[PDB]
């Protein structure tokens, strides 16, 4: 009855398979092509890659889309090049283009709810240029631009700012199309954007501007500037002369293909989690006159200028981790016509190095980049960088102390590379000015850096004998109980005792016994510290051996906060000639708990430091003491977030460390807040004082000191915004209230604008 399967088969399947191809090694070759494309001609390789990708679609239809979307968000400096490669894949395969637009839109909505509003725009400007490839219908594009500007009538201002930007940022590309099939509602939409911009509050400008001056080049708001650019464009009949459009060489293949539609986009509503970008301020220091030798520089209002800087900015973003690759791709920058790449490549690097609040990358990054371009462009770039410097200098009068710092740093670390060679007499105008004012101050602070990198006498030589009046003084200590016959000094004999103690290597228990001969004891510290530093004043190592060896001695003295201060005060009285020596000692005295941050803060705003309160080293010590506080707060938070993860007998033993690490966090976060609160307390104090004084004595408020301090207060907000945005309640109720002097209250209000 029942029968087994006829025939001696079993399905007819492979007993053994043989790998004839691969996926991974292939999707690395597809990625390579989707990348290396645009490095033969362009329209040649593009057309070739168009088909090669298609011949891989049956298997990797979903993978090829991954690379394209990725490349679209990571490489905006090639936008067009890829808007074409897609337009072709759309000209041969229709269902592909739709499976891409649907992809982009989705990818976009992700990075939008992920607070990546910078990558977001990249994609937005991509969909735009896809209209220039008949891949997207002009209407459905304006549809998205009707719900972008719609936001202005919705909440924070930075939010509205962005959508208005993401929209206007695209017009240089898809503006000639939009204002062609719908110029009816175009101007009507512009009528909306127009009003909003005027309605906006330009309160943050004074703080974000590099130069507060008006001439020659004004530092305009990142929007009001761009807007005028779009206007000069609409007037020029939407004609632009730079953007490279490869698809204009494929008019045949494209026109035939059909288009797609953009699904009605509704912006993800505003939540208390979304973090919008901070308002920018277009950095400008060049016009066509600065370069009469080369091509005419695109106007400051020319929409081309908005693109040049843009692409250059992104080019650095994509290769900043490699200076030899960054400068390379930087010099080899395309374009429709000839433009001064030197004057832009430079004005872009400075546009970042001086960007407020903070640069997109580490400060030292740009120092090497510019140096690499001088190797890559030996007889063209350097001259531009030299002039760019001369120009910066002449405009120090109205610069921002914050930016001024990075200029002092870069310049000095630049000279240090090229034998400190620099025609100094170029800046003779400073020899006859108030030392307090910029230029004179700058040259000193700079010659102070050059010294630190080399040494004293080295600098004395290079600078003209007339500039020797600005050279940093001979960096030697000051031993109060020195060879001076000041025998009648308090505890003179004892200081001599310690002198032989250290000269013969004395123990900790020994130095203590001797200090039992001094009348909390101020003079007891004024002798030990004074003596030690002197004996170990040969070099840094000896000093670090000092703070090390007799660490216990210090700890006992600098136990009370008042005592901690006195240690610094004395340690300063000894090294008031060698600021660098102070920075490191103030550093190793914090990392060894000899003193702390709360102590340093006060000592900075103390009367011993009221003489050099304006100098640079005072702040390269403050914005380094706070950094340590943050790197310590984060260190624990991290160490806690890795102990909670690890939690996935041992239980209790681990949950135990969890609790103890959470109380460690709450503590570190506390001292951190105290530090920042102390800062403003001392600032608000010394500022209110300088105001109540001048406003009474019948004198002007705007003094070299008031300026070089008010910005030091502002600099705290800028360089540490993320954190200070946590004490808003406390500050608003205790420190900065409506009963605070307007000039001091304004500096805080300017801060609130950064993300509100």
């Amino acid at each position: 009855s029942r029968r087994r399967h006829s025939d001696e088969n079993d399905g007819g399947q492979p007993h053994k398979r043989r790998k004839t191809s691969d996926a991974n090694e292939t999707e690395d070759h597809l990625e390579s092509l989707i990348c290396k494309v645009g490095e033969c001609s362009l329209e040649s390789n593009l057309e070739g890659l168009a088909g090669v990708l298609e011949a891989d679609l049956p298997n990797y239809k979903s993978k090829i889309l991954r690379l394209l979307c990725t490349v679209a968000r990571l490489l905006p400096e090639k936008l067009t090049i890829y808007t074409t490669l897609v337009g072709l894949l759309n000209a041969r395969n229709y269902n592909f283009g739709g499976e891409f637009v649907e992809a982009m839109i989705r990818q976009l909505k992700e990075s939008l709810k992920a607070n990546n509003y910078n990558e977001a725009v990249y994609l937005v400007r991509f969909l735009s240029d896809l209209v220039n490839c008949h891949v997207i219908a002009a209407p459905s594009m304006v549809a998205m631009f009707e719900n972008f500007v719609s936001v202005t009538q919705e909440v924070p201002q930075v939010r509205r700012d962005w959508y208005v930007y993401a929209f206007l940022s695209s017009l240089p590309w898809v503006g000639k199309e939009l204002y062609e099939k719908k110029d009816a509602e175009m101007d009507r939409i512009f009528a909306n954007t127009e009003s909003y911009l005027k309605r906006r509050q330009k309160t943050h400008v004074p703080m974000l501007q590099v130069w507060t001056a008006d001439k020659p080049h004004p530092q305009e708001e990142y929007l009001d500037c761009l807007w005028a650019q779009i206007q000069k464009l609409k007037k020029d009949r939407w004609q632009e002369r730079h953007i490279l459009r490869p698809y204009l060489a494929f008019d045949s293949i494209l026109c035939e293909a059909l288009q797609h539609n953009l699904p009605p986009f509704t912006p993800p509503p505003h939540t208390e989690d979304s973090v919008y970008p901070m308002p920018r301020v277009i950095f400008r220091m060049f016009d066509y006159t600065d370069d009469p030798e080369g091509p005419v520089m695109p106007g400051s209002h020319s929409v081309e200028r908005f693109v040049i800087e843009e692409n250059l900015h992104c080019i650095i973003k994509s290769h900043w981790k490699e200076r030899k690759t960054c400068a390379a791709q930087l010099v080899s920058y395309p374009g429709k016509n000839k433009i001064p790449l030197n004057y832009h490549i430079v004005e872009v690097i400075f546009a970042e190095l001086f960007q407020l609040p903070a640069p997109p990358h580490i400060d030292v990054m740009y120092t090497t980049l510019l140096i690499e371009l001088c190797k890559l462009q030996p007889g063209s770039l350097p001259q531009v960088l030299a002039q760019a410097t001369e120009m910066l200098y002449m405009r120090l009068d109205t610069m921002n102390t914050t930016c001024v710092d990075r200029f002092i740093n870069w310049f000095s670390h630049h000279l240090s590379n090229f034998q400190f060679r620099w025609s100094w007499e170029d800046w003779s105008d400073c020899l006859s000015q108030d030392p307090e004012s910029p230029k004179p101050k700058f040259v000193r602070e700079v010659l102070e850096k050059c010294m630190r990198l080399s040494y004293h006498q080295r600098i004395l030589d290079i600078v003209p004998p007339t500039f020797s009046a600005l050279c940093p003084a001979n960096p030697t200590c000051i031993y109060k109980y020195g060879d001076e016959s000041s025998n009648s000094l308090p505890g003179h004999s004892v200081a001599l005792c310690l002198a032989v103690a250290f000269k013969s290597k004395a123990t900790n228990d020994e130095i203590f016994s001797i200090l039992k001969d001094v009348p909390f004891n101020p003079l007891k510290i004024e002798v030990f510290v004074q003596t030690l530093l002197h004996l170990a004043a040969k070099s840094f190592s000896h000093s670090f051996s000092a703070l090390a060896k007799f660490h216990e001695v210090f700890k006992t003295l600098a136990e009370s906060d008042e005592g901690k201060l006195h240690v610094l005060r004395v340690m300063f009285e000894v090294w008031r000639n060698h600021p660098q020596m102070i920075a490191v000692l103030v550093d190793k005295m914090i990392r060894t708990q000899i003193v702390d941050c709360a102590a340093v803060a006060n000592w900075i705003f103390s009367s011993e430091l009221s003489r050099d309160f304006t100098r640079l080293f005072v702040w390269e010590i403050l914005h380094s003491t706070i950094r340590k506080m943050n790197k310590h707060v984060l260190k624990i938070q991290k160490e806690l977030e890795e102990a909670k993860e690890k939690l996935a007998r041992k239980d209790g033993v681990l949950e135990e460390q969890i609790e103890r690490l959470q109380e460690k966090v709450e503590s570190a976060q506390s001292e951190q807040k105290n530090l920042f609160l102390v800062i403003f307390q001392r600032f608000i104090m010394i500022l209110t004082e300088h105001l109540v004084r001048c406003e009474t004595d019948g004198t002007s408020v705007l003094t070299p000191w008031y300026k070089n301090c008010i910005e030091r207060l502002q600099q705290i907000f800028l360089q540490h915004h993320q954190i200070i945005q946590q004490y808003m309640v406390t500050l608003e109720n205790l420190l900065f209230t409506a009963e605070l002097d307007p000039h001091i209250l304004a500096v805080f209000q300017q801060f609130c604008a950064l993300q509100a």
Binding site: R323, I362, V364, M365, S416, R452, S454, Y455
Partner: protein, 80 residues
């Protein structure tokens, strides 16, 4: 080991380059922890222990390959 070390071997240095200079410079790519000059007098190199590795990386990208005392600084990863 090198994939997690926070110290740099600094080579090709001027026999007159001092710890002070090395400090002022390498302090640009983060906070430093320790510096040890090479001897036998000078020998033309030193070690630069940072705190984090992120700071150490930045010294390999920027402070590395640059010129100091008219010589090009050569820094490599070290194993403590």
């Amino acid at each position: 080991l090198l994939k997690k070390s926070c110290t740099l071997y600094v080579g090709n240095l001027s026999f007159y380059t001092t710890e002070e200079q090395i400090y002022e410079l390498f302090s640009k790519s983060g906070d430093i922890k320790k510096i040890i000059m090479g001897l036998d007098t000078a020998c033309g190199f030193c070690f630069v222990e940072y705190y984090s590795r992120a700071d150490a990386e930045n010294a390999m990208r920027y402070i590395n390959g640059t010129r100091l005392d008219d010589r090009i600084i050569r820094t490599d990863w070290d194993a403590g």
